C-alpha cells in the first residue's frame, strides 16, 4: 500500500567518467543517476582508493567501454541494484566493452533490469561470464538479448571454481570465486532481499527490513515522492523517470540525446523531452501545443541507418526527402528490441520522397514498423531511377507491410533477392500497389528461386495414404491425382504439370523416429533416407526394423525449370511385432544332484511385447561303455569337458521436341509345444521338462532331475500376436518365438551319492576268496569298471586292490582272489565314464580251510 524507500534521495544528472581518476569525484553523494552513466578511456583505475556505496539506481544504462587498470566493478558499483532503461542506448542496458583489466564483475547487489538486454564483449580477463542467470534479471518476456563473447573462457580461466549458489540447474551462478547470485521465488521475482525473503510489489528489487518493522523499498517501482512510493504523482507534480517533480524542476531538468541536450517539458502530469504525437513545443519551449492540421510536417534528409541508435534521430519526422535512399542496414543477432526501437524512430513517417531500400539486414523481421507510411514517392528512384523499393540479402526478413496495410508507389520497380523467409506470394501482394499496376513481376526483378526458399509457404499438400504394413515392409500410396497437360476442370485438388515429361516422379523420404517429430530436411542432413523418383505414385518401403516407428513424407520432383511443387505432412507409423531376438547371457548351473539353476537376460530388442518365457530341458545320455580305457592304471576324476538429376531429362525433352517437329508434316526346433514334464520309467526323475514362465522372470530352477546327467537347456522368448495375425491369419508361418542357443551343463551333479553298497566275502573251500557287492541305484556316470580292494588285519600290512571290466564277476558270484591265512577286510567301488567313486565299507573273512 504505502511504504518508505531506503535512504534519502540525492540524485545527480547523467555522468561521464573520462580520462583520469580524479573525475570519479563527480560521483559524490548521489544515490541514483537521473540519466546514463558511462566510464571510458580511464587509462588506470587502480589509484581509486574509495568506493561509492550510495550509488544504487541508474535510470538509463551503464556502459563501461575501454577502461584500463580496473579489476572489478564492485569498487565503483557496491550497491547498484536496478537498471530501469528509461533511455535505452542501442537496445542494451548494461555494456562492458573492450576492457583488458576486468577480471570479476563484483556486482553483488544487482537484482533487476527493466528494459533492454546486456552485452559483454572483448574482456579477455573476464572470468565467471557464464555464471549469471541473466534471464531472471531481465524482463521475463523478451529475455533473448544476453550476449557475451571472447571473454577468455577458453582455457586460461581455470579459476571458475565458484563456491562449489552451488550447482543449481547444473550451473554455479557465482560472482567472483566466492560470491553467488541470490534467487527469488516467482511470487517476488527479482524483488527479494535474500534467497527467500520476499518484498511487496510496491518496491523494485526488494526492500530492507529493520528491527522497527519499517520496511523500506530499494527503489519505488512506479514513482516516488518525498521518499515515498505511489502508483502516480500527486496533482501539481510531474513524473520524471523515478520521482515526482514540480514544473520549475522539470524546466531545470535535462537529458542528453544524440549530441544534444533536451530540457524536459511539464506536460499532462509528466516531464518529457518530446511532445506527444500531434503536438509541438511552444516558442518558449515551456509547454506543448496541438499540431496544426493534427500533424506537424517535420522533414529530415534521407540517410543510412546502421543500427538502432541511429534510428532514434529520425524520431518524430514525417517526410524523408533527398536523392539518397533510406538504406536500412540493421545487423542484430536474435533481434529483441529492434521492432520497438525502429517503431519509436520511424512510426511518424507517412510519406517518403526518396526511395526506400533495405539491404543486408539480420534480425529485421518485417517492415511493419513503418506504421504511418502511406506512399513511397520514389521521385528520384535509386540505381539510375530503376527501382523505388530495393530489398536484398535480408537473412531474416519474412513479411512486408503489416496486415491490411496499403502504400502507394508512384515510380520505379520493386526488387527482391536472397531473402530466405520472404515467400513469393507475400511479395506479389504488392502487385496492386504500384502505379503501373503490373500483373506480375518479371524474373529480372523478383528472384523467384532465391526468395522464400526457406519458408514453408508454397507447399501444396498431398493426401498421402498408408496402404499396408508388414514385419519389415510397408506400402505408401499418394491419393492426390495430378493434372498433366489438359486443365481438366480445375479446382479438383489439382496439382498440375503442363508437360508430362517435366514431372520426374514422386520422392519418398523415411527415417526411424520413436517420437515422430523429425523436421523436414534442410543440405547435407542425412537423417532421411530417400528412395529413387517414382511416377506411378506408389512405393514399397522395405527392410524396416519390425515394430519400429518410421516417419515419412512425400515430395514431388520436377525439372528445375518447372515450379509446380507440392509436398505432404510428416505422417508416422509403426511396423509389426516381427520375431523376438535371442535370449542374452544364458548360463546353467547345478544346485544339487537333482536341482538345476539357469540365468539369463534380454538385453536385446524383443519387438512387440514379451507375453511369456518358456524353457525346455532335455536329458541326452552318454554313450555306452568305451573299451579304449584301462582300469586301476588309467583312473579318472573326470570334471566337465563339454548431382544434376535433371540434365538427362532436359536433353531428352528437347530432343523429343526437335524430333516431333520433324517427323510429322502437313499437306529340431519348437514348432509347437505345451507345458509338460516327462517322468522316468520308474518315475524317479523327470527325463525332460518343458514349462512356460511369466515375463517377470530372469532366472529359475528345475527340480527332481537325476544325479550325474547332461540336461541340455533350451530357452526362448515369445511375443504377442496382432488380431489380424490370428483372425485374418491362421496358425501357420508361426514366427511367434525367438531364436535360441542350447546351453549345456554336463557337470558331475553333485555328490558321490551312490557307487557301490552291500559288500560280502566268502571262499571256495589258502583257499581262494570270493568278494561280492551290489551295483549303485543308478550308474554313477555309465560305470565302466569296478575297483576291488582287500587288506589283512595285521600290523604293517597294506591294502591290495585289483580291477575288472564289470559284469564278469557275476559268473563266479563275485570276484575271486587268492588269499593266505588270516583275517582280511574287503572294499569295492565302481569307476565310470564320470570318474571315481568312494570305496564302500569293509566286511571281513577269515581263511581256515581244512586239509
Amino acid at each position: 500500500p504505502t511504504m518508505r524507500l531506503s535512504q534519502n534521495v540525492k540524485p545527480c544528472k547523467s555522468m561521464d567518467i573520462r580520462n583520469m581518476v580524479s573525475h570519479f569525484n563527480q560521483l559524490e553523494n548521489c544515490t541514483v543517476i537521473e540519466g546514463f552513466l558511462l566510464i571510458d578511456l580511464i587509462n588506470d583505475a587502480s589509484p581509486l582508493n574509495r568506493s561509492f556505496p550510495k550509488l544504487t539506481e541508474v535510470t538509463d544504462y551503464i556502459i563501461i567501454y575501454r577502461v584500463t587498470g580496473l579489476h572489478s566493478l564492485s569498487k565503483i558499483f557496491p550497491n547498484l541494484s536496478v537498471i530501469r532503461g528509461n533511455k535505452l542506448f542501442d537496445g542494451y542496458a548494461l555494456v562492458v566493452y573492450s576492457n583488458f583489466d576486468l577480471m570479476d564483475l563484483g556486482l553483488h547487489k544487482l537484482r533487476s533490469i527493466t528494459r533492454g538486454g546486456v552485452r559483454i564483449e572483448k574482456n579477455h580477463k573476464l572470468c565467471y561470464d557464464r555464471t549469471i542467470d541473466w534471464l531472471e534479471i531481465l524482463a521475463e518476456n523478451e529475455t533473448q538479448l544476453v550476449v557475451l563473447t571472447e571473454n577468455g573462457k577458453e582455457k586460461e580461466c581455470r579459476l571458475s571454481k565458484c563456491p562449489g549458489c552451488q550447482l543449481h540447474n547444473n550451473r554455479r551462478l557465482c560472482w567472483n570465486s566466492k560470491l553467488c547470485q541470490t534467487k527469488c521465488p516467482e511470487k517476488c521475482r527479482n524483488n527479494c532481499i535474500d534467497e527467500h525473503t520476499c518484498c511487496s510489489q510496491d518496491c523494485l528489487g526488494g526492500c530492507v527490513i529493520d528491527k522497527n518493522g519499517n520496511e523500506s523499498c530499494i527503489s519505488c517501482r512506479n514513482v516516488s515522492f518525498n521518499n515515498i512510493c505511489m502508483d502516480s504523482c500527486p496533482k501539481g507534480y510531474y513524473q520524471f523517470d523515478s520521482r515526482c517533480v514540480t514544473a520549475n524542476e522539470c524546466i531545470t531538468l535535462t537529458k542528453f540525446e544524440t549530441n544534444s541536450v533536451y530540457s524536459g517539458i511539464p506536460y499532462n502530469g509528466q516531464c518529457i523531452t518530446h511532445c506527444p504525437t500531434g503536438y509541438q513545443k511552444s516558442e518558449n519551449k515551456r509547454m506543448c501545443e496541438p499540431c496544426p492540421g493534427g500533424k506537424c510536417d517535420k522533414e529530415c534528409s534521407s540517410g543510412l541507418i546502421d543500427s538502432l541508435e541511429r534510428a532514434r534521430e529520425f524520431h518524430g519526422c514525417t517526410i524523408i526527402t533527398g536523392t539518397e535512399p533510406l538504406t536500412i542496414s540493421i545487423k542484430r543477432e536474435s533481434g529483441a528490441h529492434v521492432m520497438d526501437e525502429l517503431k519509436y524512430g520511424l512510426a511518424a513517417v507517412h510519406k517518403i520522397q526518396s526511395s526506400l531500400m533495405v539491404h543486408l539486414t539480420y534480425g529485421l523481421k518485417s517492415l511493419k514498423f513503418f506504421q504511418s507510411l502511406t506512399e513511397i514517392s520514389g521521385d528520384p528512384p535509386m540505381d539510375a531511377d530503376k527501382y523505388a523499393l530495393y530489398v536484398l540479402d535480408n537473412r531474416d526478413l519474412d513479411e512486408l507491410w503489416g496486415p491490411n496495410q496499403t502504400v502507394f508507389i508512384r515510380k520505379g520497380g520493386v526488387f527482391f533477392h536472397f531473402n530466405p523467409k520472404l515467400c513469393v506470394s507475400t511479395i506479389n501482394q504488392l502487385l496492386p500497389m504500384l502505379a503501373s499496376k503490373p500483373k506480375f513481376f518479371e524474373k529480372s526483378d523478383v528472384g523467384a528461386d532465391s526468395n522464400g526458399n526457406r519458408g514453408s509457404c508454397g507447399t501444396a499438400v498431398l493426401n498421402v495414404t498408408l496402404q499396408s504394413v508388414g514385419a519389415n515392409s510397408a506400402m505408401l500410396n499418394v491419393t492426390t491425382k495430378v493434372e498433366i497437360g489438359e486443365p481438366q476442370k480445375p479446382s479438383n485438388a489439382t496439382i498440375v504439370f503442363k508437360d508430362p515429361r517435366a514431372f520426374i516422379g514422386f520422392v519418398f523420404y523415411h527415417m526411424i523416429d520413436p517420437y515422430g517429430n523429425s523436421t523436414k530436411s534442410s543440405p547435407c542432413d542425412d537423417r532421411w533416407k530417400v528412395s529413387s523418383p517414382e511416377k506411378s505414385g506408389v512405393m514399397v518401403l522395405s527392410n524396416l526394423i519390425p515394430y519400429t516407428n518410421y516417419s515419412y513424407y512425400v515430395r514431388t520432383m520436377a525439372i528445375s525449370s518447372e515450379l509446380t511443387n507440392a509436398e505432404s505432412d510428416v505422417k508416422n507409423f509403426r511396423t509389426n511385432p516381427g520375431r523376438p531376438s535371442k535370449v542374452t547371457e544364458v548360463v546353467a548351473t547345478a544346485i544339487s544332484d537333482s536341482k538345476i539353476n539357469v540365468t539369463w537376460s534380454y538385453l536385446d530388442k524383443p519387438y512387440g511385447v514379451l507375453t511369456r518365457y518358456f524353457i525346455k530341458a532335455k536329458l541326452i545320455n552318454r554313450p555306452t561303455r568305451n573299451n579304449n580305457r584301462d582300469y586301476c592304471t588309467e583312473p579318472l576324476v573326470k570334471a566337465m569337458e563339454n548431382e544434376y538429376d535433371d540434365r538427362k531429362v532436359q536433353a531428352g525433352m528437347e530432343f523429343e521436341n526437335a524430333l516431333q517437329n520433324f517427323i510429322f508434316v502437313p499437306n529340431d526346433d519348437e514348432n509347437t509345444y505345451k507345458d509338460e514334464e516327462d517322468l522316468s520309467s520308474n518315475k524317479q526323475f523327470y527325463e525332460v521338462f518343458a514349462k512356460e514362465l511369466p515375463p517377470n522372470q530372469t532366472h529359475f530352477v528345475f527340480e527332481k532331475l537325476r544325479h550325474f546327467t547332461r540336461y541340455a537347456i533350451f530357452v526362448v522368448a515369445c511375443r504377442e500376436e496382432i488380431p489380424s495375425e490370428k483372425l485374418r491369419d491362421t496358425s501357420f508361418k508361426k514366427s511367434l518365438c525367438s531364436d535360441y542357443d542350447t546351453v549345456f551343463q554336463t557337470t558331475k551333479r553333485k555328490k558321490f551319492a551312490d557307487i557301490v553298497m552291500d559288500l560280502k566275502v566268502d571262499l571256495e573251500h589258502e583257499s581262494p576268496v570270493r568278494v561280492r557287492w551290489t551295483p549303485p541305484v543308478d550308474p554313477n556316470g555309465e560305470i565302466v569298471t569296478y575297483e576291488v580292494a582287500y587288506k589283512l588285519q595285521k600290523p604293517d600290512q597294506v591294502e591290495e586292490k585289483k580291477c575288472i571290466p564289470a559284469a564278469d564277476f557275476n559268473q563266479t558270484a563275485g570276484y575271486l582272489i587268492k588269499l593266505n591265512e588270516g583275517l582280511y577286510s574287503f572294499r569295492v567301488r565302481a569307476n565310470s565314464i564320470a570318474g571315481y567313486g568312494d570305496f564302500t565299507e569293509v566286511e571281513h573273512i577269515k581263511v581256515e580251510p581244512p586239509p
Binding site: 497437360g485 525433352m653 516431333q660 510429322f664 508434316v665
Partner: peptide, 29 residues
C-alpha cells in the same frame, strides 16, 4: 477429344496423333 484448346505436349501429343488418325501420314517429300 471435342475441346479445341488442349495445351498438348510430349508423349501425350505423340499418342494423340495416333488416336486421332491411325490410317497414316503424308511423308516428307
Amino acid at each position: 477429344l471435342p475441346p479445341g484448346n488442349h495445351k498438348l505436349c510430349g508423349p501425350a501429343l505423340s499418342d494423340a496423333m495416333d488416336v486421332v488418325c491411325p490410317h497414316g501420314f503424308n511423308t516428307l517429300p
